[PDB]
Amino acid sequence: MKTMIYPHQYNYIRSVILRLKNVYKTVNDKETVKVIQSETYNDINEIFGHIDDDIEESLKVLMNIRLSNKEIEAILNKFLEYVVPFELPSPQKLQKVFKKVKKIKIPQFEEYDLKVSSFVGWNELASNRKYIIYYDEKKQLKGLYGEISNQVVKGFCTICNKESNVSLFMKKSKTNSDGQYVKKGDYICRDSIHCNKQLTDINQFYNFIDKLD
Amino acid sequence: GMKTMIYPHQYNYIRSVILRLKNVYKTVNDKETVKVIQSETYNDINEIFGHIDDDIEESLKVLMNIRLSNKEIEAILNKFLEYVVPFELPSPQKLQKVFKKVKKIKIPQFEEYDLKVSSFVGWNELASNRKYIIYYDEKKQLKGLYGEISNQVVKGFCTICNKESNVSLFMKKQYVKKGDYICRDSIHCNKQLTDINQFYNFIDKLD
Ligand SMILES: [Cl-]
Ligand code: NA
Ligand code: NA
Ligand code: NA
Ligand code: NA
Ligand code: NA
Ligand code: NA
Ligand code: NA
Ligand code: NA
Ligand SMILES: [Zn+2]
Ligand SMILES: [Zn+2]
């Protein structure tokens, strides 16, 4: 049985593999290549409690300076087999998370996209909203929405930490007994699917959520 | 103070090496490796400009500090963007000439930023399973082609930008055509394109 890994761990493995390939291609310093080779081997190896023969072979191929694009493709495809994809909730569970939102519905998602997703986010332009759903560390379905500005700028996304097309996302806290609430937020990728593909550390996502208060 | 003119792919390359350096600062804990990457990055950027100025000098100084921040990076990218000569969209009359056989042809609307990062312009017409591509050759002449783009999407390295992407088989428009896999989304393709020679080689290997 293949070890199960999370989508963000797959994204991380892909990231370090591509970083290594770029070092092979463009960095002429022998000792630097060795340092990055070792770092990459460790970065990938540490994800698994347990590496099997296929991963051992992939690592061997990765550690060769003649690593090719075709070889990378094959290795990425192999690593994808280990991923447990994001599980879209049933309509009844989704509605329980957004009890005050009538008629709510999550757009269809391609299977690869669920394999790289730590959360699912979609925009409803009519209401200028982004909806976000995810599971917490206890595997409970959670959801929120906020206003997403129409203005898009270049900046680093607060969730994935990559330089991207971002918009200001503002969430209202639950309204207290006196009708008062806090409204906080920050810039995040307008396109949450691309955001998820860029997300290699899920703690960044959870930190974003917590910062909304 | 006139700004040295650079090409969109050169800006993309500069952005690429800056992000690479930041990731080394953040994740690679080896003093000598950091210094090597710092020096390479400095050289990569300096060599693109040749003629620099006080703004570039200041940007390089900030980049060379291991405390480089995201906010500083965004500021530097915005400054460097000011040096780029964007892709020039052709007038409709000129576009017509390039595609004489195609009627009612019209380029989509493109954002200003997207033109600053574009070495070519590509768009899809799903009704005909077609991708159109326009570009300027090395003699600055406007050129265009189109072909069938498969509806099948796979993960793989793009023949144009050389990055791992969502690619589809493109066949330039009986006979056998093997095709080449390229990004379905040409705007994203362009953003990933840091070496113009890869694009030209792709063109050459069609025609
Ligand atoms: Cl290769
Ligand atoms: Na990394
Ligand atoms: Na790479
Ligand atoms: Na890299
Ligand atoms: Na790269
Ligand atoms: Na590079
Ligand atoms: Na990175
Ligand atoms: Na790391
Ligand atoms: Na080039
Ligand atoms: Zn993001
Ligand atoms: Zn491409």
Q: Which residues of chain A are in CATH 1.20.1280.250 domains?
A: 1-85
B1-86 CATH, one of 1.20.1280.250, 3.20.20.70, 3.30.360.10, 1.10.490.10 = 1.20.1280.250
Which tokens hold the place of B127?
């009704």
| Resolution of the experimentally solved model in angstroms | 1.6
Selection from A86, A74, A23, A17 nearest residue A47 by Cα: A17
Which tokens hold the place of B137?
């050759």
Give the HSE-up count for residue A162: Cα atoms under 13 Å, Cβ half-sphere. Answer: 20
**CB contact, 8 Å: B82 with chain A?**
no
Distance CA(A212)–CA(A205), nearest Å, equals 11
Query: A36 vs B28: CB contact, 8 Å cut-off?
Result: yes
**CB contact, 8 Å: A72 with chain B?**
yes
| Cβ–Cβ under 8 Å, residues A176 and A95 | no
Distance CA(A185)–CA(A209), nearest Å, equals 9
Which tokens hold the place of B142?
């406007």
Angle between helices B8-27 and A7-26 in degrees, nearest 10: 110
Q: How far is B78 from chain A (nearest CA, A)?
A: 9
Distance CA(A161)–CA(B38), nearest Å, equals 21
Q: Which amino acid is at B138?
A: E
Distance CA(A162)–CA(B52), nearest Å, equals 28
Residues in chain B within 8 Å Cβ distance of A77: 155
Give the method of determination: X-ray
Q: Which residues of chain B are in CATH 1.20.1280.250 domains?
A: 1-86
Q: Which of B33, B74, B77 sits opposite A32 (nearest CB)?
A: B33
Q: How far is B70 from chain A (nearest CA, A)?
A: 7
Selection from A140, A1, A8, A141 nearest residue A83 by Cα: A8
Q: Is the torsion defined by CA of B43, B48, B51, B56 positive or negative?
A: negative
Query: A36 vs B40: CB contact, 8 Å cut-off?
Result: no
Distance CA(A84)–CA(A106), nearest Å, equals 20
Distance of CA B197 to CAs A24, A47, A212, B145, B162, Å?
A: 19, 37, 46, 18, 11
Which tokens hold the place of A144?
């929120």
What is residue B100's DSSP assignment? S
Q: Which CATH class is domain A1-85?
A: mainly alpha
**CB contact, 8 Å: A213 with chain B?**
no
Burial class from Cβ neighbours inside 10 Å (0-12, 13-18, 19+) for residue A51 reads middle
Residue with tokens 């595997």: A139
Residues 6+ apart with CB under 8 A from B160: B182, B183, B189, B193, B198, B199, B202
Q: Is the torsion defined by CA of B199, B165, B121, A160 positive or negative?
A: negative
Phi and psi (nearest 5°) for A72?
A: -60, -45
Instruction: Decide: helix, strand or coil at residue A28.
Output: coil
Distance of CA B173 to CAs B100, B101, B152, B177, Å?
A: 14, 12, 18, 10
Strands B164-172 and B142-149: antiparallel
Query: Taking CA atoms, what residue in A is nearest to B111?
Result: A152
Distance CA(B15)–CA(B21), nearest Å, equals 10
